[PDB]
Design a protein around this motif. Structure first.
Motif, PDB file in Angstrom:
ATOM      1  N   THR A  84     -13.946  14.232  67.387  1.00 20.07           N
ATOM      2  CA  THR A  84     -12.808  14.530  66.829  1.00 20.07           C
ATOM      3  C   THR A  84     -12.487  15.863  66.465  1.00 20.07           C
ATOM      4  O   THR A  84     -13.486  16.630  65.899  1.00 20.07           O
ATOM      5  N   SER A  92     -16.264   7.629  61.413  1.00 22.21           N
ATOM      6  CA  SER A  92     -15.551   9.039  61.781  1.00 22.21           C
ATOM      7  C   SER A  92     -16.024   9.908  60.854  1.00 22.21           C
ATOM      8  O   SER A  92     -16.189  11.212  61.235  1.00 22.21           O
ATOM      9  N   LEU A 103      -5.452  11.266  66.708  1.00 21.71           N
ATOM     10  CA  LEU A 103      -6.290  10.655  65.541  1.00 21.71           C
ATOM     11  C   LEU A 103      -5.294   9.892  64.610  1.00 21.71           C
ATOM     12  O   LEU A 103      -5.481   9.056  63.773  1.00 21.71           O
ATOM     13  N   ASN A 149      -5.006   6.243  64.481  1.00 24.92           N
ATOM     14  CA  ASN A 149      -4.945   5.247  63.432  1.00 24.92           C
ATOM     15  C   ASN A 149      -3.950   4.261  63.727  1.00 24.92           C
ATOM     16  O   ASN A 149      -4.432   2.754  63.802  1.00 24.92           O
ATOM     17  N   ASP A 182     -18.691   5.646  66.177  1.00 27.56           N
ATOM     18  CA  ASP A 182     -18.085   6.914  66.462  1.00 27.56           C
ATOM     19  C   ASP A 182     -18.844   7.930  66.714  1.00 27.56           C
ATOM     20  O   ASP A 182     -18.599   9.041  67.412  1.00 27.56           O
ATOM     21  N   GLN A 192     -13.094   4.320  60.632  1.00 33.74           N
ATOM     22  CA  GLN A 192     -13.022   5.754  59.957  1.00 33.74           C
ATOM     23  C   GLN A 192     -13.888   6.324  59.279  1.00 33.74           C
ATOM     24  O   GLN A 192     -13.959   7.374  59.434  1.00 33.74           O
ATOM     25  N   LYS A 223      -7.235  15.863  66.119  1.00 32.93           N
ATOM     26  CA  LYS A 223      -6.397  15.263  64.815  1.00 32.93           C
ATOM     27  C   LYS A 223      -5.258  14.594  65.030  1.00 32.93           C
ATOM     28  O   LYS A 223      -4.569  14.190  64.262  1.00 32.93           O
TER      29      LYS A 223
END
Length: 458
Positions: A106, A366, A147, A151, A43, A363, A109
Protein backbone atom coordinates in the motif's frame (compact mmCIF):
# COMPACT_ATOMS: atom_id res chain seq x y z
CA UNK A 1 -42.04 -44.65 19.62
CA UNK A 2 -38.27 -44.26 19.56
CA UNK A 3 -38.23 -43.16 16.00
CA UNK A 4 -35.36 -40.95 15.08
CA UNK A 5 -32.82 -42.06 17.50
CA UNK A 6 -32.57 -39.38 20.20
CA UNK A 7 -28.84 -39.46 20.17
CA UNK A 8 -29.41 -38.80 16.63
CA UNK A 9 -32.45 -36.44 17.48
CA UNK A 10 -30.34 -34.12 19.46
CA UNK A 11 -27.84 -34.35 16.56
CA UNK A 12 -30.50 -33.09 14.16
CA UNK A 13 -30.56 -30.33 16.70
CA UNK A 14 -26.63 -29.96 17.22
CA UNK A 15 -25.45 -28.72 13.85
CA UNK A 16 -29.06 -27.55 13.07
CA UNK A 17 -29.08 -29.95 10.17
CA UNK A 18 -31.86 -31.56 8.05
CA UNK A 19 -32.63 -34.95 9.63
CA UNK A 20 -33.31 -36.53 6.28
CA UNK A 21 -30.58 -35.24 4.07
CA UNK A 22 -28.50 -35.05 7.15
CA UNK A 23 -25.40 -37.02 6.06
CA UNK A 24 -24.79 -34.18 3.79
CA UNK A 25 -26.66 -31.58 5.85
CA UNK A 26 -23.83 -30.22 7.85
CA UNK A 27 -21.36 -30.72 5.14
CA UNK A 28 -21.83 -27.65 2.95
CA UNK A 29 -21.35 -25.91 6.16
CA UNK A 30 -18.27 -27.85 7.06
CA UNK A 31 -16.79 -26.71 3.84
CA UNK A 32 -18.04 -23.21 3.59
CA UNK A 33 -17.85 -22.19 7.14
CA UNK A 34 -14.14 -22.79 6.52
CA UNK A 35 -14.45 -20.91 3.32
CA UNK A 36 -15.83 -18.10 5.48
CA UNK A 37 -12.60 -18.02 7.46
CA UNK A 38 -11.10 -17.10 4.23
CA UNK A 39 -13.63 -14.30 4.12
CA UNK A 40 -11.29 -13.24 6.75
CA UNK A 41 -8.60 -12.35 4.21
CA UNK A 42 -4.94 -11.09 4.75
CA UNK A 43 -2.47 -8.31 3.41
CA UNK A 44 1.18 -9.14 4.21
CA UNK A 45 1.43 -12.72 3.05
CA UNK A 46 -1.40 -13.85 5.43
CA UNK A 47 -3.10 -16.83 3.96
CA UNK A 48 0.49 -17.73 3.81
CA UNK A 49 0.23 -17.46 7.56
CA UNK A 50 -2.75 -19.83 7.38
CA UNK A 51 -0.52 -22.22 5.59
CA UNK A 52 2.16 -21.78 8.31
CA UNK A 53 -0.31 -22.76 10.90
CA UNK A 54 -1.64 -25.56 8.67
CA UNK A 55 1.79 -27.11 8.83
CA UNK A 56 1.88 -27.85 12.57
CA UNK A 57 -1.64 -29.18 12.22
CA UNK A 58 -0.48 -31.65 9.55
CA UNK A 59 2.21 -32.95 11.85
CA UNK A 60 -0.49 -33.20 14.46
CA UNK A 61 -2.40 -35.40 12.05
CA UNK A 62 0.47 -37.82 12.01
CA UNK A 63 0.73 -38.28 15.76
CA UNK A 64 1.26 -35.91 18.55
CA UNK A 65 4.18 -37.28 20.42
CA UNK A 66 4.99 -34.65 23.07
CA UNK A 67 1.61 -35.17 24.76
CA UNK A 68 -1.17 -36.86 22.83
CA UNK A 69 -3.42 -35.61 25.65
CA UNK A 70 -3.97 -31.84 26.33
CA UNK A 71 -5.80 -28.47 26.74
CA UNK A 72 -4.58 -26.97 23.54
CA UNK A 73 -4.96 -30.54 22.15
CA UNK A 74 -8.65 -30.47 22.47
CA UNK A 75 -8.36 -27.33 20.48
CA UNK A 76 -5.84 -29.09 18.36
CA UNK A 77 -6.44 -32.53 16.82
CA UNK A 78 -9.88 -32.67 15.23
CA UNK A 79 -10.06 -29.38 16.92
CA UNK A 80 -7.05 -28.94 14.58
CA UNK A 81 -8.43 -31.14 11.81
CA UNK A 82 -11.19 -28.59 11.14
CA UNK A 83 -8.47 -25.94 11.58
CA UNK A 84 -6.22 -27.59 9.08
CA UNK A 85 -9.11 -27.26 6.66
CA UNK A 86 -9.36 -23.67 7.58
CA UNK A 87 -5.64 -22.95 7.45
CA UNK A 88 -5.92 -24.20 3.98
CA UNK A 89 -9.20 -22.47 2.96
CA UNK A 90 -7.85 -19.27 4.27
CA UNK A 91 -4.65 -20.13 2.60
CA UNK A 92 -6.74 -20.21 -0.51
CA UNK A 93 -8.57 -16.91 -0.54
CA UNK A 94 -5.58 -15.81 1.40
CA UNK A 95 -3.72 -16.77 -1.71
CA UNK A 96 -6.31 -15.61 -4.23
CA UNK A 97 -6.22 -12.30 -2.59
CA UNK A 98 -2.55 -12.99 -1.74
CA UNK A 99 -2.42 -11.93 -5.35
CA UNK A 100 -3.31 -8.64 -3.95
CA UNK A 101 -1.61 -9.10 -0.56
CA UNK A 102 1.78 -9.84 -1.98
CA UNK A 103 1.21 -7.38 -4.74
CA UNK A 104 -0.96 -4.77 -3.41
CA UNK A 105 1.60 -3.18 -1.14
CA UNK A 106 0.00 0.00 0.00
CA UNK A 107 1.29 3.40 -0.76
CA UNK A 108 -0.58 4.82 -3.68
CA UNK A 109 -3.69 5.11 -1.46
CA UNK A 110 -5.78 5.65 -4.48
CA UNK A 111 -3.51 3.06 -5.98
CA UNK A 112 -1.80 -0.09 -4.86
CA UNK A 113 2.00 -0.04 -5.11
CA UNK A 114 1.74 -2.73 -7.63
CA UNK A 115 -1.74 -2.96 -9.01
CA UNK A 116 -2.71 -6.07 -10.84
CA UNK A 117 -1.87 -3.53 -13.63
CA UNK A 118 -5.24 -2.32 -14.76
CA UNK A 119 -6.62 -2.17 -18.25
CA UNK A 120 -6.80 1.59 -18.33
CA UNK A 121 -3.03 1.69 -17.99
CA UNK A 122 -3.64 2.04 -14.29
CA UNK A 123 -0.12 2.37 -13.21
CA UNK A 124 0.62 5.42 -15.31
CA UNK A 125 4.28 5.45 -14.31
CA UNK A 126 4.91 8.51 -16.47
CA UNK A 127 2.99 10.66 -13.97
CA UNK A 128 3.83 10.88 -10.26
CA UNK A 129 3.37 7.45 -8.76
CA UNK A 130 2.27 8.57 -5.29
CA UNK A 131 -0.92 9.87 -6.67
CA UNK A 132 -1.30 7.09 -9.17
CA UNK A 133 -4.46 7.80 -11.25
CA UNK A 134 -6.75 7.85 -8.30
CA UNK A 135 -9.06 5.08 -9.15
CA UNK A 136 -10.37 4.77 -12.58
CA UNK A 137 -13.14 2.47 -12.02
CA UNK A 138 -15.93 4.46 -10.51
CA UNK A 139 -18.51 3.15 -12.91
CA UNK A 140 -17.26 0.03 -11.11
CA UNK A 141 -16.41 -0.64 -7.42
CA UNK A 142 -12.84 -1.75 -7.00
CA UNK A 143 -9.56 -0.62 -8.24
CA UNK A 144 -6.16 -2.20 -8.35
CA UNK A 145 -5.24 1.45 -8.33
CA UNK A 146 -7.42 2.66 -5.55
CA UNK A 147 -7.22 1.99 -1.90
CA UNK A 148 -10.24 4.12 -1.15
CA UNK A 149 -12.11 2.39 -3.83
CA UNK A 150 -10.27 -0.65 -2.73
CA UNK A 151 -12.59 0.05 0.06
CA UNK A 152 -15.12 0.01 -2.66
CA UNK A 153 -13.53 -3.17 -4.17
CA UNK A 154 -13.78 -5.29 -1.14
CA UNK A 155 -16.91 -3.57 0.08
CA UNK A 156 -18.93 -4.33 -2.89
CA UNK A 157 -16.98 -7.52 -3.40
CA UNK A 158 -18.01 -8.95 -0.22
CA UNK A 159 -21.48 -7.53 -0.78
CA UNK A 160 -21.76 -9.47 -3.97
CA UNK A 161 -20.19 -12.49 -2.40
CA UNK A 162 -22.79 -11.91 0.17
CA UNK A 163 -25.51 -12.32 -2.30
CA UNK A 164 -23.90 -15.47 -3.43
CA UNK A 165 -23.43 -16.64 0.07
CA UNK A 166 -26.98 -15.98 1.14
CA UNK A 167 -28.51 -17.25 -1.97
CA UNK A 168 -26.37 -20.34 -1.82
CA UNK A 169 -27.15 -20.67 1.74
CA UNK A 170 -30.83 -20.26 0.99
CA UNK A 171 -30.51 -22.76 -1.75
CA UNK A 172 -28.31 -25.58 -0.55
CA UNK A 173 -30.50 -25.90 2.36
CA UNK A 174 -33.45 -24.79 0.33
CA UNK A 175 -32.89 -28.02 -1.40
CA UNK A 176 -31.96 -29.57 1.93
CA UNK A 177 -35.03 -28.00 3.40
CA UNK A 178 -36.67 -29.37 0.35
CA UNK A 179 -39.00 -31.34 2.24
CA UNK A 180 -38.66 -34.40 -0.08
CA UNK A 181 -35.36 -35.76 0.89
CA UNK A 182 -37.04 -34.64 3.98
CA UNK A 183 -40.74 -34.21 4.25
CA UNK A 184 -42.18 -35.20 0.78
CA UNK A 185 -43.24 -32.16 -1.09
CA UNK A 186 -43.79 -29.18 1.30
CA UNK A 187 -45.65 -26.68 -0.78
CA UNK A 188 -46.58 -24.13 1.64
CA UNK A 189 -43.16 -22.69 2.15
CA UNK A 190 -40.62 -24.20 -0.27
CA UNK A 191 -41.83 -22.64 -3.49
CA UNK A 192 -43.41 -19.37 -2.31
CA UNK A 193 -40.31 -19.14 -0.18
CA UNK A 194 -38.04 -19.52 -3.20
CA UNK A 195 -39.85 -16.66 -4.72
CA UNK A 196 -39.39 -14.13 -1.93
CA UNK A 197 -35.78 -14.85 -1.43
CA UNK A 198 -35.42 -14.85 -5.12
CA UNK A 199 -36.78 -11.38 -5.05
CA UNK A 200 -34.36 -9.92 -2.52
CA UNK A 201 -31.19 -11.68 -3.20
CA UNK A 202 -31.94 -12.38 -6.71
CA UNK A 203 -33.11 -9.22 -8.27
CA UNK A 204 -30.57 -7.31 -6.26
CA UNK A 205 -27.84 -9.61 -7.28
CA UNK A 206 -29.12 -9.44 -10.81
CA UNK A 207 -28.39 -5.85 -10.15
CA UNK A 208 -24.88 -6.43 -8.78
CA UNK A 209 -24.26 -8.70 -11.68
CA UNK A 210 -25.69 -6.03 -14.01
CA UNK A 211 -23.41 -3.58 -12.35
CA UNK A 212 -20.86 -6.21 -13.08
CA UNK A 213 -22.24 -6.41 -16.58
CA UNK A 214 -22.42 -2.84 -17.84
CA UNK A 215 -19.58 -0.35 -17.49
CA UNK A 216 -22.34 2.11 -17.18
CA UNK A 217 -20.56 5.10 -18.82
CA UNK A 218 -22.32 4.60 -22.07
CA UNK A 219 -25.48 3.58 -20.11
CA UNK A 220 -25.43 5.58 -16.81
CA UNK A 221 -27.40 3.75 -14.07
CA UNK A 222 -25.32 4.23 -10.79
CA UNK A 223 -22.21 2.41 -9.34
CA UNK A 224 -23.35 2.31 -5.82
CA UNK A 225 -25.79 -0.47 -6.41
CA UNK A 226 -27.81 1.17 -3.78
CA UNK A 227 -27.97 4.01 -6.18
CA UNK A 228 -29.75 1.64 -8.44
CA UNK A 229 -31.80 -0.31 -5.93
CA UNK A 230 -32.72 2.08 -3.25
CA UNK A 231 -34.25 4.10 -5.87
CA UNK A 232 -36.09 0.87 -6.25
CA UNK A 233 -38.74 1.31 -3.60
CA UNK A 234 -40.64 3.86 -5.68
CA UNK A 235 -38.73 3.87 -8.98
CA UNK A 236 -41.50 2.76 -11.32
CA UNK A 237 -43.93 5.55 -12.31
CA UNK A 238 -46.87 3.18 -12.04
CA UNK A 239 -46.87 2.47 -15.75
CA UNK A 240 -45.89 -0.95 -17.09
CA UNK A 241 -42.76 -0.55 -19.20
CA UNK A 242 -39.86 -2.82 -19.82
CA UNK A 243 -36.16 -2.98 -20.33
CA UNK A 244 -34.63 -2.06 -23.58
CA UNK A 245 -31.20 -2.25 -22.00
CA UNK A 246 -30.02 -3.62 -18.62
CA UNK A 247 -32.63 -3.15 -15.94
CA UNK A 248 -34.19 -0.10 -17.21
CA UNK A 249 -37.70 -0.99 -16.59
CA UNK A 250 -37.13 -4.64 -16.12
CA UNK A 251 -37.12 -3.03 -12.73
CA UNK A 252 -40.38 -1.20 -13.51
CA UNK A 253 -42.14 -4.54 -13.70
CA UNK A 254 -39.88 -5.85 -10.88
CA UNK A 255 -42.19 -4.05 -8.49
CA UNK A 256 -45.33 -5.82 -9.70
CA UNK A 257 -43.38 -9.00 -9.72
CA UNK A 258 -41.94 -8.22 -6.27
CA UNK A 259 -45.36 -8.03 -4.68
CA UNK A 260 -46.07 -11.33 -6.31
CA UNK A 261 -43.11 -13.10 -4.73
CA UNK A 262 -43.56 -11.87 -1.22
CA UNK A 263 -47.36 -12.10 -0.95
CA UNK A 264 -47.71 -15.88 -1.64
CA UNK A 265 -45.11 -16.84 0.90
CA UNK A 266 -47.59 -15.29 3.28
CA UNK A 267 -50.59 -16.14 1.37
CA UNK A 268 -49.61 -19.65 0.36
CA UNK A 269 -48.90 -20.39 3.95
CA UNK A 270 -52.61 -19.70 4.52
CA UNK A 271 -53.00 -22.95 2.78
CA UNK A 272 -50.53 -24.56 5.24
CA UNK A 273 -52.92 -23.45 7.93
CA UNK A 274 -55.82 -24.59 5.98
CA UNK A 275 -54.16 -27.77 4.95
CA UNK A 276 -53.18 -29.48 8.08
CA UNK A 277 -56.37 -30.56 10.02
CA UNK A 278 -57.64 -32.88 7.40
CA UNK A 279 -54.80 -35.11 6.82
CA UNK A 280 -55.08 -35.83 3.09
CA UNK A 281 -54.18 -32.29 2.14
CA UNK A 282 -51.44 -32.15 4.79
CA UNK A 283 -50.00 -35.23 3.13
CA UNK A 284 -49.46 -33.50 -0.19
CA UNK A 285 -46.69 -31.47 1.48
CA UNK A 286 -45.61 -34.21 4.04
CA UNK A 287 -44.50 -37.98 4.24
CA UNK A 288 -47.38 -38.46 6.66
CA UNK A 289 -49.51 -41.05 4.71
CA UNK A 290 -47.31 -43.99 6.03
CA UNK A 291 -49.85 -45.83 8.36
CA UNK A 292 -51.86 -49.04 7.65
CA UNK A 293 -54.92 -47.98 9.70
CA UNK A 294 -54.76 -44.76 7.70
CA UNK A 295 -55.10 -46.75 4.43
CA UNK A 296 -58.37 -48.41 5.59
CA UNK A 297 -59.69 -44.93 6.47
CA UNK A 298 -58.45 -43.53 3.11
CA UNK A 299 -60.05 -46.40 1.15
CA UNK A 300 -63.44 -45.73 2.79
CA UNK A 301 -62.96 -41.95 2.42
CA UNK A 302 -62.31 -42.16 -1.33
CA UNK A 303 -65.46 -44.20 -1.95
CA UNK A 304 -67.74 -41.99 0.20
CA UNK A 305 -66.70 -38.54 -1.18
CA UNK A 306 -63.82 -36.30 -2.34
CA UNK A 307 -63.28 -32.58 -1.69
CA UNK A 308 -59.95 -31.56 -0.48
CA UNK A 309 -58.08 -28.49 -0.68
CA UNK A 310 -55.82 -27.38 2.12
CA UNK A 311 -58.19 -28.34 5.01
CA UNK A 312 -59.80 -24.93 5.86
CA UNK A 313 -59.88 -24.74 2.05
CA UNK A 314 -61.22 -28.37 2.06
CA UNK A 315 -63.99 -26.42 3.82
CA UNK A 316 -63.24 -28.20 7.00
CA UNK A 317 -60.88 -26.65 9.53
CA UNK A 318 -57.64 -24.99 9.15
CA UNK A 319 -59.13 -21.57 9.64
CA UNK A 320 -61.26 -23.35 12.22
CA UNK A 321 -57.89 -24.59 13.26
CA UNK A 322 -55.76 -21.52 12.40
CA UNK A 323 -52.98 -19.00 13.27
CA UNK A 324 -53.59 -19.04 16.96
CA UNK A 325 -56.58 -20.95 18.17
CA UNK A 326 -56.49 -24.59 17.36
CA UNK A 327 -54.75 -26.69 14.74
CA UNK A 328 -51.18 -26.14 15.44
CA UNK A 329 -49.46 -25.67 12.07
CA UNK A 330 -52.08 -23.32 11.26
CA UNK A 331 -51.05 -21.62 14.52
CA UNK A 332 -47.39 -22.08 13.79
CA UNK A 333 -46.88 -20.81 10.38
CA UNK A 334 -48.20 -17.36 11.08
CA UNK A 335 -45.77 -17.22 13.97
CA UNK A 336 -42.96 -18.71 12.01
CA UNK A 337 -43.42 -17.63 8.47
CA UNK A 338 -44.29 -14.07 9.43
CA UNK A 339 -41.09 -13.97 11.28
CA UNK A 340 -39.09 -16.07 8.80
CA UNK A 341 -39.64 -14.03 5.73
CA UNK A 342 -38.71 -10.98 7.66
CA UNK A 343 -35.81 -12.77 9.00
CA UNK A 344 -34.89 -13.08 5.42
CA UNK A 345 -34.33 -9.39 6.02
CA UNK A 346 -32.09 -10.43 8.76
CA UNK A 347 -30.50 -12.83 6.31
CA UNK A 348 -30.10 -9.75 4.35
CA UNK A 349 -28.38 -8.16 7.24
CA UNK A 350 -26.44 -11.20 7.75
CA UNK A 351 -24.28 -10.93 4.77
CA UNK A 352 -23.69 -7.40 5.45
CA UNK A 353 -21.91 -8.42 8.50
CA UNK A 354 -19.94 -10.75 6.53
CA UNK A 355 -19.09 -7.89 4.32
CA UNK A 356 -18.11 -5.87 7.19
CA UNK A 357 -16.14 -8.51 8.84
CA UNK A 358 -14.03 -8.89 5.93
CA UNK A 359 -13.86 -5.30 5.06
CA UNK A 360 -12.54 -4.72 8.36
CA UNK A 361 -10.29 -7.63 8.50
CA UNK A 362 -8.62 -6.58 5.43
CA UNK A 363 -8.18 -3.14 6.58
CA UNK A 364 -6.83 -4.34 9.84
CA UNK A 365 -4.18 -6.36 8.38
CA UNK A 366 -3.52 -3.50 6.08
CA UNK A 367 -2.81 -1.42 9.09
CA UNK A 368 -0.80 -4.13 10.67
CA UNK A 369 1.30 -4.15 7.54
CA UNK A 370 1.73 -0.46 7.95
CA UNK A 371 3.07 -0.99 11.44
CA UNK A 372 5.60 -3.72 10.55
CA UNK A 373 6.99 -1.72 7.69
CA UNK A 374 6.70 1.41 9.81
CA UNK A 375 9.14 -0.13 12.14
CA UNK A 376 11.69 -0.95 9.49
CA UNK A 377 12.59 1.65 6.80
CA UNK A 378 13.41 5.01 8.59
CA UNK A 379 16.49 5.85 10.66
CA UNK A 380 18.84 8.56 12.07
CA UNK A 381 22.28 8.07 10.45
CA UNK A 382 23.25 5.05 12.53
CA UNK A 383 23.40 1.91 10.38
CA UNK A 384 24.14 -0.08 13.49
CA UNK A 385 20.78 1.12 14.72
CA UNK A 386 19.17 -0.17 11.50
CA UNK A 387 20.76 -3.71 11.61
CA UNK A 388 19.54 -4.08 15.19
CA UNK A 389 16.11 -2.43 15.18
CA UNK A 390 14.71 -4.58 12.44
CA UNK A 391 14.35 -7.47 14.91
CA UNK A 392 11.55 -5.79 16.81
CA UNK A 393 9.66 -5.44 13.55
CA UNK A 394 9.67 -9.11 12.98
CA UNK A 395 8.59 -9.66 16.52
CA UNK A 396 5.86 -7.25 15.68
CA UNK A 397 4.86 -9.36 12.76
CA UNK A 398 4.85 -12.09 15.32
CA UNK A 399 2.38 -10.13 17.40
CA UNK A 400 0.29 -9.37 14.35
CA UNK A 401 -0.29 -12.96 13.68
CA UNK A 402 -1.53 -13.65 17.17
CA UNK A 403 -3.86 -10.80 16.90
CA UNK A 404 -4.86 -11.88 13.44
CA UNK A 405 -5.66 -15.33 14.55
CA UNK A 406 -7.50 -14.03 17.48
CA UNK A 407 -9.72 -11.76 15.56
CA UNK A 408 -9.81 -14.35 12.97
CA UNK A 409 -11.27 -16.76 15.34
CA UNK A 410 -13.82 -14.34 16.43
CA UNK A 411 -14.77 -13.61 13.02
CA UNK A 412 -14.74 -17.15 12.15
CA UNK A 413 -17.05 -17.58 14.89
CA UNK A 414 -18.87 -14.69 13.59
CA UNK A 415 -19.06 -16.38 10.37
CA UNK A 416 -19.98 -19.40 12.30
CA UNK A 417 -22.86 -17.46 13.56
CA UNK A 418 -23.46 -16.10 10.23
CA UNK A 419 -23.87 -19.64 9.25
CA UNK A 420 -25.52 -20.35 12.55
CA UNK A 421 -28.34 -18.20 11.65
CA UNK A 422 -27.88 -18.54 7.92
CA UNK A 423 -26.89 -22.12 7.05
CA UNK A 424 -29.01 -23.50 9.72
CA UNK A 425 -31.82 -20.96 8.87
CA UNK A 426 -32.40 -23.18 6.07
CA UNK A 427 -31.03 -26.46 7.44
CA UNK A 428 -33.32 -27.51 10.50
CA UNK A 429 -36.12 -24.95 10.34
CA UNK A 430 -36.24 -21.27 9.31
CA UNK A 431 -33.59 -20.36 11.85
CA UNK A 432 -32.39 -24.01 12.43
CA UNK A 433 -31.78 -25.08 16.12
CA UNK A 434 -29.61 -23.68 18.99
CA UNK A 435 -28.02 -26.99 19.96
CA UNK A 436 -25.05 -25.46 18.65
CA UNK A 437 -22.80 -26.83 15.92
CA UNK A 438 -21.05 -28.15 18.78
CA UNK A 439 -22.20 -27.43 22.28
CA UNK A 440 -21.00 -30.69 23.87
CA UNK A 441 -18.22 -32.84 22.27
CA UNK A 442 -15.64 -30.43 20.81
CA UNK A 443 -16.32 -31.32 17.12
CA UNK A 444 -20.05 -31.10 16.34
CA UNK A 445 -19.55 -28.29 14.06
CA UNK A 446 -17.51 -31.09 12.64
CA UNK A 447 -20.39 -33.50 13.40
CA UNK A 448 -21.51 -32.75 9.86
CA UNK A 449 -18.91 -35.38 8.82
CA UNK A 450 -20.11 -38.65 7.31
CA UNK A 451 -17.80 -40.94 9.12
CA UNK A 452 -19.44 -39.78 12.27
CA UNK A 453 -22.89 -39.32 10.69
CA UNK A 454 -25.43 -40.28 13.27
CA UNK A 455 -27.84 -40.00 10.40
CA UNK A 456 -27.60 -42.45 7.50
CA UNK A 457 -28.79 -39.63 5.51
CA UNK A 458 -31.73 -39.55 7.84
Amino acid sequence: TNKFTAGFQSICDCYGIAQYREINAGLPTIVTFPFMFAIMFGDMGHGFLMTLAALSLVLNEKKINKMKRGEIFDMAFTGRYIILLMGVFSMYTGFLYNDIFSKTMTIFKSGWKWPDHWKKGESITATSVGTYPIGLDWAWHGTENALLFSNSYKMKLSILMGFIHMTYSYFFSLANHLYFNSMIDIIGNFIPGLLFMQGIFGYLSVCIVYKWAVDWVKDGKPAPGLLNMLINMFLSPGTIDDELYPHQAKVQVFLLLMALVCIPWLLLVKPLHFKFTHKKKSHEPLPSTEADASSEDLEAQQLISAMDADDAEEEEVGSGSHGEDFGDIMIHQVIHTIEFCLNCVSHTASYLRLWALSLAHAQLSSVLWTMTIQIAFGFRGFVGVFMTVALFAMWFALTCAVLVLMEGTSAMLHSLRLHWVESMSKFFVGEGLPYEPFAFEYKDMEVAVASASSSASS
